[PDB]
Design a protein around this ligand. Structure first.
Ligand SMILES: [Cl-]
Ligand SMILES: [Cl-]
Ligand SMILES: [Mg+2]
Ligand SMILES: [Mg+2]
Ligand SMILES: [Mg+2]
Ligand SMILES: [Mg+2]
Ligand SMILES: [Mg+2]
Ligand SMILES: [Mg+2]
Ligand SMILES: [Mg+2]
Ligand SMILES: [Mg+2]
Ligand SMILES: [Mg+2]
Ligand SMILES: [Mg+2]
Ligand SMILES: [Mg+2]
Ligand SMILES: [Mg+2]
Lengths: 326, 326, 326, 326
């Protein structure tokens, strides 16, 4: 192998029409590399178990949560490309120090699927990048753009192998960590989700608390009324893993509102919008049940929303159930 | 770190009461190491997609299936410790060549969770080791012992990190691959499963085809009749991953008989018995619904069985549903 | 470690006063990473022994020579930053294709110390970067600048660890490959060579062919006339290794003219100028015996010169011997 | 690659005629693996510079010296295979604790070429294994056997790649660390040194202090009296590196007695005997100048001797110079 298409090179060669974005990305990828390495020897570096605090969303934080958060913050700030960061792990927006100030806003989940670290299930890092457009002092309000205004977004999946899915507006590209070469190399370009899939994905243990629309849709997946095979169920419990399987296999992923979580559980800014962006870029759909997730005007950095995404025909059929029930 | 407890050293220091077993294991671990490395750069070494054949169980084989199978076969044979191997990927039993003949029989699944390779979910390698006891020529019949007669058994999980769970009769020990040192190092000794868990795990997309006992038990998990919280649902779709989460978090994993699979789908010899062995060693239970899996006399190397395993109280409650319905 | 000073970040944060240079470098580093990985498993990937040709300097080429050459060429060209490359391994200058044309000229030795690959001695990659200043069509003549006009230069040393020494005009910085993180991280900033050292380094097996000046200087190292200890001898036989030891320990490295090589043996463009640049940046000296190497106007891409470099006082004393003998 | 010849497997398959030796070796290799990994990120893990003490041979100890020493001691002791260790870094012999006592004696240099760590030259680990033959309490005296009585011996070279040379009495075999697989794999079997070489290797900076025999031999290498080409000079300054180059390229390596070191400088037990053993096994010679090194009865664990080894015809010619001068 003497001509490897690294991430950086592919972004440079397609983007031939902005560098500052590509420098922000290279910092993110460095963080992702560092995280991936820590994840991969987590038990040996005695890194499982609690950290000893709760975040502003009610999540019992792990030792990795803290570690991967500083990696991302330090790396992003050091790029000279950011002004405002939002993180699952910090209460307020982190304003970049003036001497390092750049034009971009990043919303990120430094480690997703935390309840699944101990059992070595796939886990990930999720990010959305915006451009600061307002003229005032950098504040949390700059991070409150509609996901419709994302400049680049994606996720890292620390699974059986380490993978980045990324989009800067021209489709989704999949990159993979080459351990030999310590870099991300392109493996799939311009991935498009199947129009219709064969897998449904949700925590079905909340059945007792679903609204009628959800209850009905699920019934159709398991008990179709047209002789077709019932859909297979899969639910990893790490949103990155479930969302990535959705992208490459097809199907639907659901984390909707329920009685216990009246407005959904997943965070709009740094979980829902980044994956919504990827799925839309891949020809799929991503909805709250009433509108596309990317069209929701966020009103608070840690705001939650319902999320239903995946193959267009599957989401369309889910939205029918919503209409048929309101 | 100047005093690392490697697998080999822990087995040597506890087993102070057989080397030939420990040499067989060291060969297995070499195979596992090789597999883990291949898995981890699978997309880059262009290793996804089909192989171009079906196995004797009806499974569309992947390129890895073939690769990891030869690794295991070559490694095991080379140990001078085996006489008979059974593999998911080979139609008949593989008799070791006379000049390399040893006393042990190994049943293995060289790569489990094959439908989940492309989406980078956790996948694994599963193995059970027996002692040849009969006096005749090494044949498939030597591989047909009850799992009750296992001498050592375990699995490798190629997840966010690479882990081996192993038992030689004195409890379960968890080892992890140290990438720096290229060896397995002990992380948890004598793991014991929770008496009762909070997670149920099955492909719920077969709901339409469950027998009444299964339908009823699941109803109790989602709609308890005693005010308690419903159990959470998790289903990775790779039996190693689901079984490992069961071991460390607690709960229940189910792949029972259904209309489409009248006698279950998982293979007795190289899937069910090895995990049944681990779970029993950890204080859990593993049943076909009518007897403990380890007590089933196998009659054919590729025989299937129903599998329900996990926290004792959870399995007990499942067996009630079976009694209450027969 | 949550705030790592990677190469890229250090160059970005010091250079705060040009990106296109930093993109050229990132491509070089990718090549260096790839080479380092190949070197490190060279025997296993059956990569020792001949390639089956001779280069335009009379060197029997190895399989690595060829491999590392394409890596460097493909990587550099792909940066969109080059117009002209010179390589030890190619007869003529390689003009970049118009659609990828940039402003920089690179002279490189893709793998140095080739006679030392088989015995696993340290080996390296050497490079000098110039800015195209002339207005005509990109040609070999653009690569014929005085090393005095270097914009950035350095070397990779694939030793017990992998290290890059780099200068862009503001001193020498040492970076090291972090295998965990797949990147170069700063280990020493602004290294300065000892004014006077205690080690002399040359192939002493050419004693019979040295000119009087060299013979005399060496006599003074082994038989001092002032009661001081004689200098220690060290000679690895890979110029990068010997030159790097010179930089960090102090002393002198000599590959001067001799009867067999009347004008020296080392190549001016892609061996001598890059190390001359590093040593001068570090407060040392690097001479042909009659002038500073960086002041030689090259007249041909594969031109050779005598090289004597290292601690200033040691080189000064060597130049005395030259004056005292002409 | 589906059938890799690992060290362990090659030793097992050739030794088909002792396991306890092979378990001792597997512990050594684990130590070597750990050391190799530490060496390779030595600058990043801030591991250069002094330790703050002197050993009983007069050597300013490094931080690695200490680290690699405990690795070797802990690993070897844990094998249940040793009774007595001798180390360059410990004043007295280390008697194994009774409950871990085995039959073997190991003499080792846990890290050789310490003055060359900072400049990233090749460095190594050197070892000789004996069988305890005496009946008394394990003491230092058990470590005082003639190298003629070695049961297995070799070295690790942490160079551009990591290599082990090993002999158990049936020739020399070369193994290499596969980073992918974390194990040593055979690369060359039964290596034999060239009858006569073209490279001479010694610290020539001691010229002023050589005895006449050495002065004369060196004169013949640089100023032959028969029209042949003078030999090339190479001197890395790490005995493992120089000795390994000698083995694979041919030639001679010299660290003889001189005025400053009247009885030589290299340590008999854990430097000279192990390499003497390798070279003799490879058809070469290794002498003190008056007898074969392996025939010297050691009288003290930290005893020094002159060492001249390499291609037989070259050593023979050196011994002539000794005879011609006594
Ligand atoms: Cl997973
Ligand atoms: Cl070296
Ligand atoms: Mg959390
Ligand atoms: Mg999170
Ligand atoms: Mg999250
Ligand atoms: Mg299969
Ligand atoms: Mg399988
Ligand atoms: Mg399977
Ligand atoms: Mg060459
Ligand atoms: Mg070269
Ligand atoms: Mg060269
Ligand atoms: Mg020392
Ligand atoms: Mg030493
Ligand atoms: Mg030594």
């Amino acid at each position: 192998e003497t001509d490897m298409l690294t991430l950086t090179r592919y972004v440079m060669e397609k983007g031939r029409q902005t560098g500052e974005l590509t420098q922000l990305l290279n910092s993110m990828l460095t963080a992702i590399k560092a995280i991936s390495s820590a994840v991969r020897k987590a038990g040996l570096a005695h890194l499982y178990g609690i950290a000893g605090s709760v975040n502003v969303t009610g999540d019992e934080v792990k030792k990795l949560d803290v570690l991967s958060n500083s990696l991302v913050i330090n790396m992003l700030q050091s790029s000279y490309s950011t002004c405002v960061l939002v993180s699952e792990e910090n209460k307020d927006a982190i304003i970049t120090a003036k001497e390092k100030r750049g034009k971009y806003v990043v919303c990120f989940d430094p480690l997703d699927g935390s309840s699944n670290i101990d059992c070595l299930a796939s886990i990930g890092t999720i990010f959305a990048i915006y451009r600061k457009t307002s003229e005032d002092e950098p504040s949390e309000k700059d991070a409150l753009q509609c996901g419709r205004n994302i400049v680049a977004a994606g996720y890292a999946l620390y699974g059986s192998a380490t993978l980045v899915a990324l989009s800067t507006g021209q489709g989704v590209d999949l990159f993979m960590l080459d351990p030999a070469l310590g870099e991300f190399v392109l493996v799939e370009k311009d991935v498009k989700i199947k129009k219709k899939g064969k897998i449904y994905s949700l925590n079905e243990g909340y059945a007792k608390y679903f609204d009628a629309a959800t209850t009905e849709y699920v019934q159709k997946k398991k008990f179709p009324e047209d002789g077709s095979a019932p859909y297979g169920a899969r639910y990893v419990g790490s949103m990155v893993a479930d969302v990535h399987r959705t992208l490459v296999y097809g199907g639907i992923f659901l984390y909707p509102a329920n009685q216990k979580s009246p407005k959904g559980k997943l965070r709009l800014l740094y979980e829902c919008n980044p994956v919504a962006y990827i799925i839309e870029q891949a020809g799929g759909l991503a909805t709250t049940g009433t509108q596309p997730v990317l069209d929701v005007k966020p009103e608070a950095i840690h705001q939650r929303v319902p999320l239903i995404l995946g193959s267009p025909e599957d989401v369309q059929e889910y939205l029918t159930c919503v209409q048929k029930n309101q």
